[PDB]
Amino acid sequence: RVKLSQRQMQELKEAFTMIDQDRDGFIGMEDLKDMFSSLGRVPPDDELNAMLKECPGQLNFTAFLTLFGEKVSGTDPEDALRNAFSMFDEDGQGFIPEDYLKDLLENMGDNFSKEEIKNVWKDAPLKNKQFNYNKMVDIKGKAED
Amino acid sequence: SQLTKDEIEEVREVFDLFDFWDGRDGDVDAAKVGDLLRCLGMNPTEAQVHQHGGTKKMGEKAYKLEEILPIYEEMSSKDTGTAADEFMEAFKTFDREGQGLISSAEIRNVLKMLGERITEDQCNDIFTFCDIREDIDGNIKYEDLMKKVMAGPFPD
Amino acid sequence: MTMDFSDPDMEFLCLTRQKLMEATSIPFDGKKNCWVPDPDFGFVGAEIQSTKGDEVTVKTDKTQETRVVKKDDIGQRNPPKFEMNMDMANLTFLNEASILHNLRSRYESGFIYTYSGLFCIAINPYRRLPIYTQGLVDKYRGKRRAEMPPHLFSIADNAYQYMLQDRENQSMLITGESGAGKTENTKKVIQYFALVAASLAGKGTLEDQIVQCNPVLEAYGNAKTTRNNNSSRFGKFIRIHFGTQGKIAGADIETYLLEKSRVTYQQSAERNYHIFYQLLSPAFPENIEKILAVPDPGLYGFINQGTLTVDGIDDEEEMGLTDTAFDVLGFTDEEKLSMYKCTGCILHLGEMKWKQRGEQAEADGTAEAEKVAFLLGVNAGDLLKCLLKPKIKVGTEYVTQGRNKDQVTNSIAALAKSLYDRMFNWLVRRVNQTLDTKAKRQFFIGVLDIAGFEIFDFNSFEQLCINYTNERLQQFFNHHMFVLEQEEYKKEGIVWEFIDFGLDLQACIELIEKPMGILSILEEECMFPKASDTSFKNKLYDNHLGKNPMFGKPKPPKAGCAEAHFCLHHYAGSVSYSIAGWLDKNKDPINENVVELLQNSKEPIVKMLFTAFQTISSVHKESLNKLMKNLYSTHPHFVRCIIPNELKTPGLIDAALVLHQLRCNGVLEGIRICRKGFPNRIIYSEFKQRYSILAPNAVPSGFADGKVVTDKALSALQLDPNEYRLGNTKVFFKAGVLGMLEDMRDERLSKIISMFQAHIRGYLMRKAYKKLQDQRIGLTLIQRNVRKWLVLRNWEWWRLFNKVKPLL
Ligand SMILES: [Ca+2]
């Protein structure tokens, strides 16, 4: 939890500070509409406001870290996840054998739902009936590509 | 009936690990009662394990923690779990010329052909893991093998 | 030790390491493998199926067949450690079955030798085998029995050393009929005593100067018997002498118990001695007329009662070598005549007919009498007169004439036998003269060849006589055993709770010798004119029917399966005897006048009859009484030769014939005796090395004491203290103790291996444990990291700092 650490807490500092041009520190509807503009996407009021409801009211940054109290739960780190996947890859990268990973998440350990299984194949970096981990670790945070 | 608080905490630890690998649900598969038991630190024979619950296949039966605990302690009620004396007098039966050396083709024959048979794979492994070598024809030290097998994968 | 299971010579005594480990490791189970009775071939190996009440079910090995054998018929078989065993004394299960096996399995792998207690058994291999090399001789020279494997030589070098260690005369008692090599064997033993005379590190060989005589003694002492083509009907003891340095210094031959009777009586398929059918042949027609006969073995009561010839026999050739041998031994072609003529006389002493008038008998011819009178060189008148009439005394001299017909016929028969007996002693005195090219004798190692123990379908006065002899022989053995085992126990400090073993045969022996026993009942019943085969029977029954265990009585058999009148329990088993004719067969009365007169003319009959009225039995007794006085003054050794099969077919065993020989042999009696005592005896080390696995402990095997471990292993198994005793150097066991111990070890060892395997599985898994542990760390991360992602991928805000920052 507090594991919304420094790297996690300063990275969140530049973030709230950009959406800025500010109302002495207030991720604003405007600071927002001004951003999703330079983001280039589509700003819906009711909605844009729906983002507000999440914080009681008035988002400085103290509230910004509090809002991200769904992020911190898992949030295990960068590398830590790579090593984790590593373990189940014996043949150096190109990564893990699909089947395995299925018998792995689906019926070994904290079992996945047949519903959770798909929520994963849809995207999934794949080929040769073999999975890609530094690619999935990637999606996790989000470099992109 | 007796396992101490710490004894339990210990069985638990191992127990969880096992229910973890087969799906954290509070149950472990009878097939795994042998292994689990081995992880607590015991060395049971297959007869021992079957006479105490171990099933052979995998869908058959399951055990909560409170069911395994008494197995652990009945199992722990035995005492010819086996010593060195017991392993030494038995290797000697095979030591043809009286030094403590035994062809490996032979120790392996013992281990694979007799008693609760041991796998080809299992033999190679225990033999690679203990650092037990044969020399020209001064076959294998049987005591070397005894001390190490009885010392654990994680010596120190 | 001193054996390399490899010195190629040992190919037939030994059995090599690989081969032994091979025999020593075959499969086995003590709760099921066993010995079971087999009609066709003795005892066979099997496995126990089901029990229930007193009726066991079994399945046999070599043929498969589920038979239903009874409880007291399942033989505990010995475990593998005992296969090809060298001394059956060491066997843990000492039953017939088991004795059969050890001996068989060794003959069937080329080994003809197998020790059983004091005995040295040796089977006929029927084929030359390397066994008698002068190189082996040295592999055996000076060694005590355990150092080498079983070998006839071991018993001689020892018989030889003892002669020196204890300065005692030694004897070798060898048994075995027809094809057993009792022959080669006696030869090979006299040979060996010779080779060792070169042993102090610096016209005939002995074997030969002695083998030279065997033809002549055989013509007068051997003959066919229902069950044997050439049976020595006398006992010979070849005494090989030595000087104080172990130096061979001579030999001579003592003879015992020549079977007179045969001289005037045949049993259907039997025959008088060989020589009779020998003289009367063609390589010597000439002699056939000096003697006074017509080449026709039939034509003579003292020769025709039984058979004419013997299948696979050519008298001629024998009357041949017999004669050639008579010269080699060196004696007067003239002497050679007397012996012959003397023999011939017996042929006539049978024609000598008779008739009577009231109660005085008279001739019914006279050619026959001057034929005898002449051949002997005495005056027929005086003969006929002293046979038919006689004059004796008190101070004056009355006509003892009593004589009737039933009386003279005997008198004549007895003359014959008496002639033959003096002739035979004579013949022997001679080869001895041939042998005495001596210096000075100090000791001896005699070899005794006696009869054996006969059990026929029809045993009569002859069988009893012989059995009385072996009974006293087996006893001699029992007694030696007794004396040794007694020291053996004391050497170890074990308590000896035993009465002489010899005594177990005294009952029977007594039932024969003892004043008012079989023989003495016979003798007295011999002095009663109207006595009868029946008068004698009752007096036997009267005296010993319910009153003595040994004495029994059979029960009518098969119309022809003769009538038996009583049976004795002999060490060799139970023998049933027929009484018909003993009264007639036993009378062998001396007729004084015939001697003083026979104390006339022709030179041999001067040395012969020059050197009351009695009986065969009384003589038998006296002779036997002597053989024993002599055997008991010697340190004995026992060799047991054995006929393996009725048909010379090397490597073949007939269970019945062999067992039969065993019960007679005395071999099985010894096992019986070993039985009641502690036959298994182990040195604490041999025990230390074999059973420690049964009660292992942390004390380094080497600093440990054998006795202590032995002791401690035996308590832990809570084995009955009666089942064993502890000696200063060995632990004595009873029956099956080792049998059990062997089976507990197989058990225990198997358990200990599963266990080791158990420790491996424990190692292998305990190693995987750390991994699994690691891999739980991982997966938890992956599910606790993916799941949030499956959520978070929809938190608008989430999308933003995912954009909001790459753009920092
Ligand atoms: Ca589970």
Side-chain angles (χ1 to χ4, degrees):
Chain A
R1 241 186 176 198
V2 293
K3 260 26 270 169
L4 173 77
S5 58
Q6 197 175 354
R7 286 49 196 141
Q8 282 181 19
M9 304 236 310
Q10 183 74 16
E11 227 236 331
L12 290 183
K13 180 59 184 175
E14 270 238 25
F16 136 115
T17 300
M18 263 186 97
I19 285 191
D20 241 336
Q21 206 34 24
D22 267 348
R23 26 223 228 169
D24 299 10
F26 285 86
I27 283 289
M29 294 231 13
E30 294 219 303
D31 296 336
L32 279 208
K33 297 193 177 180
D34 286 2
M35 176 61 79
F36 271 125
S37 180
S38 286
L39 273 227
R41 289 244 165 173
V42 143
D45 261 314
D46 227 338
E47 305 188 359
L48 183 88
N49 183 220
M51 269 170 73
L52 254 233
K53 1 177 101 188
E54 290 168 13
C55 90
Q58 236 184 302
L59 183 56
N60 12 339
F61 151 75
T62 299
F64 199 53
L65 301 182
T66 286
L67 176 72
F68 288 14
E70 51 166 34
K71 205 157 305 194
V72 200
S73 285
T75 250
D76 284 302
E78 43 179 36
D79 318 332
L81 265 180
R82 307 215 167 161
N83 198 180
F85 281 96
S86 309
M87 307 188 64
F88 308 71
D89 163 41
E90 314 173 332
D91 192 323
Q93 327 209 313
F95 316 96
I96 303 159
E98 186 192 359
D99 324 285
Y100 194 23
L101 208 127
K102 192 180 127 221
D103 196 46
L104 215 59
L105 311 175
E106 185 178 18
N107 30 44
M108 292 177 69
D110 290 323
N111 313 305
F112 264 17
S113 309
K114 296 206 174 175
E115 313 178 328
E116 294 187 346
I117 292 146
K118 151 136 277 182
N119 293 325
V120 177
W121 296 104
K122 290 203 186 170
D123 185 344
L126 302 175
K127 289 215 183 187
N128 244 168
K129 318 256 168 152
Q130 190 176 350
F131 187 59
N132 198 314
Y133 83 69
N134 270 302
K135 178 154 170 188
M136 233 318 283
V137 149
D138 268 315
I139 301 184
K140 290 332 232 195
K142 283 201 186 180
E144 184 194 9
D145 43 328
Chain B
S1 161
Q2 298 185 355
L3 311 176
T4 93
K5 283 190 265 138
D6 300 326
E7 308 218 301
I8 314 227
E9 290 182 15
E10 289 178 12
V11 185
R12 199 188 295 306
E13 295 176 7
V14 187
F15 183 76
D16 296 330
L17 179 72
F18 283 89
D19 84 306
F20 176 90
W21 284 107
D22 68 51
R24 171 155 21 175
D25 68 358
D27 318 312
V28 157
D29 192 310
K32 306 289 190 188
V33 184
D35 286 328
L36 168 56
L37 280 176
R38 285 161 191 140
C39 296
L40 280 184
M42 286 169 99
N43 298 288
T45 61
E46 303 176 10
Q48 285 163 1
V49 162
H50 287 297
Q51 297 184 0
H52 295 44
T55 67
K56 184 51 170 63
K57 49 180 137 189
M58 279 279 269
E60 297 205 39
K61 172 190 304 165
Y63 291 122
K64 314 159 209 310
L65 181 60
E66 303 80 21
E67 276 173 318
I68 262 163
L69 278 182
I71 296 189
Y72 170 61
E73 84 180 281
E74 299 306 321
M75 192 67 68
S76 68
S77 263
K78 183 63 282 163
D79 292 308
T80 183
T82 304
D85 311 320
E86 298 189 359
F87 289 137
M88 219 60 213
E89 299 304 351
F91 267 124
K92 304 229 214 98
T93 182
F94 295 99
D95 192 355
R96 301 218 194 134
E97 312 203 319
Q99 287 307 352
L101 297 177
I102 293 177
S103 132
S104 50
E106 271 189 69
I107 309 221
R108 303 208 171 219
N109 246 298
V110 163
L111 302 183
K112 298 168 57 203
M113 290 308 138
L114 302 188
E116 312 195 315
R117 359 278 313 313
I118 263 183
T119 289
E120 173 54 14
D121 198 285
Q122 294 175 318
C123 277
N124 296 301
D125 297 342
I126 192 66
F127 254 122
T128 301
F129 294 153
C130 287
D131 193 26
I132 296 180
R133 302 289 180 72
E134 61 191 42
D135 184 327
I136 296 162
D137 227 17
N139 298 308
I140 297 198
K141 299 167 177 297
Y142 55 72
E143 194 179 355
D144 222 303
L145 186 56
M146 173 184 102
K147 305 240 182 138
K148 290 173 188 155
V149 150
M150 277 179 105
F154 302 98
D156 295 292
Chain C
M1 319 192 23
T2 303
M3 297 209 82
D4 182 319
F5 331 109
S6 290
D7 201 329
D9 296 338
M10 295 288 108
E11 179 178 6
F12 287 86
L13 287 189
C14 250
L15 187 64
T16 69
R17 193 186 180 206
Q18 258 169 47
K19 301 181 182 184
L20 182 50
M21 183 94 63
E22 183 174 348
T24 306
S25 78
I26 63 154
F28 200 85
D29 177 15
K31 306 195 171 187
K32 307 256 152 283
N33 296 29
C34 61
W35 288 145
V36 89
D38 195 312
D40 280 17
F41 42 122
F43 294 97
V44 158
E47 247 168 70
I48 299 187
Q49 282 318 326
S50 66
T51 293
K52 169 170 180 176
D54 275 6
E55 189 185 341
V56 155
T57 287
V58 175
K59 158 183 195 173
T60 71
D61 311 347
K62 254 196 204 184
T63 291
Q64 287 308 4
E65 184 67 347
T66 287
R67 305 176 192 177
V68 150
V69 174
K70 287 195 178 194
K71 259 160 108 164
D72 201 340
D73 278 302
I74 61 181
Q76 302 185 338
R77 180 176 170 172
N78 281 7
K81 169 187 172 183
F82 302 111
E83 297 291 356
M84 294 316 91
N85 181 196
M86 294 163 75
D87 174 351
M88 311 180 78
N90 285 318
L91 291 190
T92 189
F93 285 138
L94 289 171
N95 49 54
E96 287 188 10
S98 289
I99 310 307
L100 174 51
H101 191 86
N102 210 167
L103 271 166
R104 184 196 283 151
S105 40
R106 283 187 54 103
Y107 182 61
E108 265 166 51
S109 287
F111 306 89
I112 56 163
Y113 294 140
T114 305
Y115 296 128
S116 211
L118 294 184
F119 305 129
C120 169
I121 302 170
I123 305 189
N124 221 336
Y126 290 121
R127 68 183 174 181
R128 300 215 86 54
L129 297 185
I131 313 180
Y132 312 79
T133 311
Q134 280 189 8
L136 288 187
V137 157
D138 293 327
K139 270 180 164 286
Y140 275 94
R141 186 64 193 301
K143 298 196 175 149
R144 91 208 136 157
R145 224 170 85 171
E147 278 178 33
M148 307 271 325
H151 197 301
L152 185 70
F153 286 161
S154 57
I155 296 193
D157 187 283
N158 290 321
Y160 187 54
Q161 304 185 359
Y162 277 122
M163 181 178 59
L164 291 191
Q165 280 186 28
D166 315 311
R167 319 222 102 203
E168 276 191 8
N169 292 310
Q170 304 282 311
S171 62
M172 287 200 51
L173 306 188
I174 319 173
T175 61
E177 308 311 345
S178 63
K182 171 127 78 90
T183 299
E184 69 175 9
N185 268 286
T186 312
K187 188 184 204 169
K188 278 131 193 245
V189 174
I190 288 133
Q191 303 198 348
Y192 186 114
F193 293 148
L195 294 195
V196 303
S199 294
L200 312 188
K203 246 301 187 51
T205 321
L206 191 59
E207 306 107 354
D208 293 321
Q209 292 174 17
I210 279 160
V211 173
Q212 260 167 34
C213 329
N214 287 359
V216 161
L217 288 184
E218 275 185 35
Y220 287 86
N222 290 37
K224 172 184 178 179
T225 79
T226 303
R227 306 194 155 208
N228 189 184
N229 298 323
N230 181 191
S231 182
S232 261
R233 302 312 273 173
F234 69 95
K236 75 172 183 204
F237 198 30
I238 297 160
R239 300 198 287 166
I240 298 178
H241 301 272
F242 292 83
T244 286
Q245 262 274 326
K247 38 206 180 176
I248 274 189
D252 59 344
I253 294 181
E254 293 181 299
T255 52
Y256 304 91
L257 312 139
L258 174 81
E259 187 178 7
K260 287 200 211 171
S261 343
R262 196 161 307 260
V263 177
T264 60
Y265 173 72
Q266 296 82 75
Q267 279 182 25
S268 261
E270 287 197 1
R271 180 184 185 209
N272 198 321
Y273 292 98
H274 288 317
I275 187 203
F276 283 115
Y277 313 91
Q278 260 187 38
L279 270 211
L280 313 172
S281 140
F284 321 90
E286 45 175 28
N287 307 308
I288 294 209
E289 305 291 311
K290 294 191 174 187
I291 285 174
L292 303 190
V294 297
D296 187 327
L299 313 209
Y300 305 84
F302 286 101
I303 269 187
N304 61 10
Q305 305 189 10
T307 298
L308 306 166
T309 60
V310 182
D311 297 326
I313 208 174
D314 188 353
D315 297 309
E316 296 182 7
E317 186 182 358
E318 301 298 358
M319 159 44 56
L321 296 177
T322 289
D323 191 13
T324 295
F326 239 143
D327 320 78
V328 174
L329 286 208
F331 295 120
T332 316
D333 296 334
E334 199 46 20
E335 286 169 8
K336 158 196 204 154
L337 182 86
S338 279
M339 190 65 97
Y340 283 21
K341 288 187 178 186
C342 292
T343 301
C345 184
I346 289 181
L347 289 166
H348 307 306
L349 290 156
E351 290 312 354
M352 306 180 91
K353 281 63 88 188
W354 302 116
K355 171 58 176 123
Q356 65 177 359
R357 299 188 172 183
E359 259 170 27
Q360 183 55 26
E362 49 187 8
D364 187 335
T366 286
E368 323 139 7
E370 67 184 6
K371 287 208 200 179
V372 284
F374 176 55
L375 278 156
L376 296 201
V378 177
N379 289 301
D382 296 310
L383 185 72
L384 273 199
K385 278 260 187 67
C386 57
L387 294 186
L388 290 181
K389 348 223 175 94
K391 305 159 196 212
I392 290 182
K393 57 259 179 147
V394 175
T396 35
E397 300 199 22
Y398 188 82
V399 114
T400 54
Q401 201 194 304
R403 314 315 74 117
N404 68 32
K405 182 186 175 182
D406 294 330
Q407 294 181 339
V408 295
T409 357
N410 254 346
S411 231
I412 289 210
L415 173 59
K417 286 176 250 162
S418 197
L419 184 67
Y420 205 81
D421 192 56
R422 307 176 185 212
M423 261 173 88
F424 192 100
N425 299 308
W426 194 65
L427 183 63
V428 169
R429 240 179 291 142
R430 280 321 260 269
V431 292
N432 272 325
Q433 283 175 23
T434 270
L435 294 180
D436 188 353
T437 359
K438 87 173 151 190
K440 186 155 189 181
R441 315 176 173 184
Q442 191 59 15
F443 310 126
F444 71 82
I445 292 177
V447 182
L448 175 74
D449 172 313
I450 210 78
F453 182 101
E454 308 177 355
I455 305 205
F456 294 156
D457 296 318
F458 185 78
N459 324 284
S460 191
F461 190 58
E462 296 84 353
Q463 284 60 61
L464 187 75
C465 273
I466 268 160
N467 289 341
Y468 163 41
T469 284
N470 275 252
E471 200 74 41
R472 292 201 60 192
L473 285 170
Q474 185 53 48
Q475 179 181 59
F476 172 71
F477 175 74
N478 290 9
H479 181 66
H480 188 70
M481 204 168 122
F482 178 70
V483 192
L484 292 178
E485 288 281 291
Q486 203 179 350
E487 283 185 26
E488 190 68 1
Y489 273 53
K490 172 179 193 311
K491 174 207 255 178
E492 301 289 341
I494 302 226
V495 163
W496 187 250
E497 26 207 42
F498 272 121
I499 188 178
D500 193 311
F501 298 120
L503 302 177
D504 291 332
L505 303 205
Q506 183 77 14
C508 197
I509 296 181
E510 274 185 22
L511 182 64
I512 290 161
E513 318 183 298
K514 281 307 196 182
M516 311 202 94
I518 321 225
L519 301 184
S520 291
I521 279 216
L522 185 66
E523 315 190 331
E524 273 191 25
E525 197 68 1
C526 275
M527 304 178 78
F528 284 97
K530 298 278 187 172
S532 122
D533 279 9
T534 326
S535 336
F536 171 63
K537 184 192 178 184
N538 299 314
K539 218 200 298 225
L540 281 186
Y541 288 80
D542 243 36
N543 258 271
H544 311 273
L545 258 212
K547 332 184 195 180
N548 189 322
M550 276 359 87
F551 191 101
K553 179 197 171 108
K555 41 82 196 179
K558 171 86 163 188
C561 196
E563 194 188 333
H565 302 119
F566 83 94
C567 64
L568 306 178
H569 147 262
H570 285 274
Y571 73 88
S574 180
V575 179
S576 316
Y577 299 100
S578 170
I579 276 305
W582 293 24
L583 290 175
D584 300 312
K585 294 188 197 172
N586 203 234
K587 295 189 186 185
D588 170 330
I590 298 186
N591 289 289
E592 279 169 26
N593 303 319
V594 192
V595 187
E596 303 287 32
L597 175 77
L598 288 185
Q599 287 189 17
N600 289 325
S601 206
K602 316 323 202 73
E603 299 184 23
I605 300 191
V606 215
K607 167 225 56 208
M608 265 119 128
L609 298 112
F610 247 157
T611 306
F613 301 35
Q614 298 332 324
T615 36
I616 281 158
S617 63
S618 78
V619 184
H620 199 308
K621 275 184 282 232
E622 193 166 13
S623 203
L624 190 38
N625 289 336
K626 204 188 148 179
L627 175 56
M628 305 293 97
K629 160 45 205 179
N630 301 323
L631 286 182
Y632 280 107
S633 265
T634 74
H635 175 168
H637 300 267
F638 309 74
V639 170
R640 312 287 107 169
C641 285
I642 297 175
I643 295 171
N645 45 68
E646 292 283 31
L647 326 161
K648 305 154 184 177
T649 292
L652 187 62
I653 294 300
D654 192 319
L657 187 62
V658 166
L659 296 187
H660 186 263
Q661 302 177 69
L662 297 186
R663 306 206 188 80
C664 306
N665 267 309
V667 144
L668 292 169
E669 188 68 350
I671 268 162
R672 188 203 111 239
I673 297 154
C674 259
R675 243 170 187 282
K676 290 201 185 185
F678 301 94
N680 299 330
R681 309 161 175 182
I682 301 128
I683 345 183
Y684 288 137
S685 47
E686 261 182 8
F687 198 79
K688 181 188 191 192
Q689 178 178 23
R690 188 84 180 170
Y691 301 118
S692 291
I693 200 179
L694 278 198
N697 86 45
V699 170
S701 230
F703 312 129
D705 170 298
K707 194 180 176 178
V708 165
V709 166
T710 291
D711 192 342
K712 299 188 176 302
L714 294 172
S715 303
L717 288 179
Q718 301 180 0
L719 191 72
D720 183 1
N722 258 306
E723 292 308 24
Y724 70 98
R725 301 226 174 303
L726 302 166
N728 310 330
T729 69
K730 332 181 165 185
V731 50
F732 288 64
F733 291 147
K734 287 233 105 209
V737 185
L738 297 181
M740 185 190 48
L741 299 188
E742 217 56 23
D743 173 77
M744 297 196 90
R745 162 183 190 287
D746 194 353
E747 192 72 2
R748 197 46 202 187
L749 180 80
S750 206
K751 177 154 175 157
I752 291 171
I753 278 146
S754 297
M755 311 201 79
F756 197 59
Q757 302 166 334
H759 281 63
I760 299 174
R761 263 156 210 162
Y763 186 102
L764 295 180
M765 177 49 75
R766 247 171 283 144
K767 186 164 175 294
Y769 190 47
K770 210 213 194 185
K771 189 191 196 178
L772 289 183
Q773 293 191 338
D774 293 335
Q775 303 189 351
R776 174 184 168 189
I777 299 312
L779 204 62
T780 302
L781 289 179
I782 286 173
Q783 310 169 300
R784 147 175 114 181
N785 276 307
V786 164
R787 291 181 186 190
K788 219 53 178 156
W789 178 86
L790 286 192
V791 150
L792 290 190
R793 45 158 198 170
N794 305 312
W795 188 230
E796 253 56 277
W797 296 103
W798 174 243
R799 316 195 193 171
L800 294 169
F801 96 84
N802 274 147
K803 329 188 193 181
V804 169
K805 261 184 288 301
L807 304 184
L808 287 211

